[PDB]
Amino acid sequence: SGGHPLEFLRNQPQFQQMRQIIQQNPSLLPALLQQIGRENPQLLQQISQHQEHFIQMLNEP
Amino acid sequence: IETPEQAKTRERSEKIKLEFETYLRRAMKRFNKGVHEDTHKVHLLCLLANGFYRNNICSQPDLHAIGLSIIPARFTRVLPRDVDTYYLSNLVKWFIGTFTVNAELSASEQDNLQTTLERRFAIYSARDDEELVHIFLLILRALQLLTRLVLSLQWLEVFCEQEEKWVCVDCVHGVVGQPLTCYKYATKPMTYVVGIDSDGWVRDVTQRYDPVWMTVTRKCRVDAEWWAETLRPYQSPFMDREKKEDLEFQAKHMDQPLPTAIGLYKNHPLYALKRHLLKYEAIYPETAAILGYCRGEAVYSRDCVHTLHSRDTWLKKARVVRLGEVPYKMVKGFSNRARKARLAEPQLREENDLGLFGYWQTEEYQPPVAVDGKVPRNEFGNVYLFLPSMMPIGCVQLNLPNLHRV
Known part of the structure; x- marks a missing residue:
């Protein structure tokens, strides 16, 4: 299949926590951006393309 | 005083160091520009996610039932296929004279948005313009009317089958069928305008309202391919409707x-x-x-x-x-x-x-x-x-x- 570069972050615990943050609590959403403010070159680099999997992962409860 | 050969070698070293420093500056500027663009795209995606969550909230049958319980029976007797601009104007005029804006209403951090909308319907008062727009959207959806909530990064679009066209509605200012007025009352920078339907499909309706789409907005928008990829999973299966909408947009653009x-x-x-x-x-x-x-x-x-x-x-x-x-x-x-x-x-x-x-x-x-x-x-x-x-x-x-x- 077309293995997306975001596949590894599927089971990443901090990535899962940020996904849960996006899903329910927008008060914690800026804190998610804080992770972006720490170090996230690859995540924002690859977030341009193949966002369907990213959106589905964010919607995952 | 350095010898001329040593002076020339020193000049070469200074020039090479300056060139490498300029290259590092160029790389840093490119990286910063890319990071800024990525952050802007992330913000756009976050706004889209918030809009999707709000639209999915606005699809609850309970809200539609509550809205219909307040709609007079004279409005329910008109079939959705027979909805015209005059009927929309009458409904908007009735809506303004019944629903009033009250900014003094308390804003609770714990109550859900659905509960807030139900309370606003019960008191018939709206805290702000966005709540009034949501209330009017729920009222329109109570009558089984295909309506899109339109946000500029808000108003409504109602599809008339007699015209087979989308008429814009602004409930706060009593504006029906005037895209220029909707652009006037929108945010100062108009770069992206999206209408999300009840089914969840998102259509970029920025062309209908913004006359600056072709001149400055086109040079100030995100990548066309990236935006198309973003909207592709949310494209409605009604291909003919999208084609007619695009043809109408082209006709409006040619009017300039x-x-x-x-x-x-x-x-x-x-x-x-x-x-x-x-x-x-x-x-x-x-x-x-x-x-x-x-x-x-x-x-x-x-x-x-x-x-x-x-x-x-x-x-x-x-x-x-x-x-x-x-x-x-x-x-x-x-x-x-x-x-x-x-x-x-x-x-x-x-x-x-x-x-x-x-x-x-x-x-x-x-x-x-x-x-x-x-x-x-x-x-x-x-x-x-x-x-x-x-x-x-x-x-x-x-x-x-x-x-x-x-």
Whole structure:
């Protein structure tokens, strides 16, 4: 299949926590951006393309 | 005082260090620009996610039932297929005179948005404009009316089957069918305007409302491919409706006579001036229709402006310039000493002609056939294999050292 570069972050615990943050609590959403403010070159680099999997992962409860 | 040789070495070192520093500055500026663009895209995605969550909230049957319980029975007797602009105007006028805006209403951080909307319906008071828009959207959806909530990064769009067209509705100011007014009351920078329907499909309706779409907004929006990829999973299956909407948008865009600034015609598909044409660009046909005149300068469609390339360029592009054709365009060329001869004699600077042939003057390339066990060659005893399709038929390329010797 077309293995997306975001596949590894599927089971990443901090990535899962940020996904849960996006899903329910927008008060914690800026804190998610804080992770972006720490170090996230690859995540924002690859977030341009193949966002369907990213959106589905964010919607995952 | 340094010796001249040491001074020259020092100058070389300083120049190299300065060049590397400038390169590092360029790399840093590119990285910062990319990070800023990524952050803007992330913010746009976050706004889209918030809008999707709010729209999914606004699809609850309980809210629709509550809205219908307040709608008078005179409105329910009109079929959704028979909804007209006059009915929409009457409903908006009734809505304004019944629902009032009260900013003094308390904002609880714990209550859900659905509970807030239910309380606003019960008290018939809206905290702000957005809550009023949501209330009117729920009221419209109570009557089984196909309505899109439109946000600019808000109003409504109602699809009339009699017109088969979307009429814009602004509940706060009592505006129906006036996209210009909706653009007027929107946020100052209009770059993206999206209508999300009840089914969840998102349509970029920025073209209908923003007249600056083609002139400044196009140069100020995100990548068209990226936005298309973003909206692709949320494209409605009603392809014909999208096509009709796009045709109406094109018709509205063609209604604009001409922009006020010559600079707006630069690199514009609908404008495409004369002076702005590049080295490979030429108007074809030269008798093309004139879209207008700006400060004495004629306007032609960009489709009439074709990119012309040299004959060998077309050969590289798997195309053959038709034999005996007069070159449509004559431009300067960059070559070996034939090029520098123009510098040697300035009168020859414009004398050297590089024949650019249009796509209308080029046919598809045809690969050669090996003859008598010998590979067909170029004009100079070589075989150009920029594309594998240009390989002679019956010949194979082998990349072996001393193969020529063998």
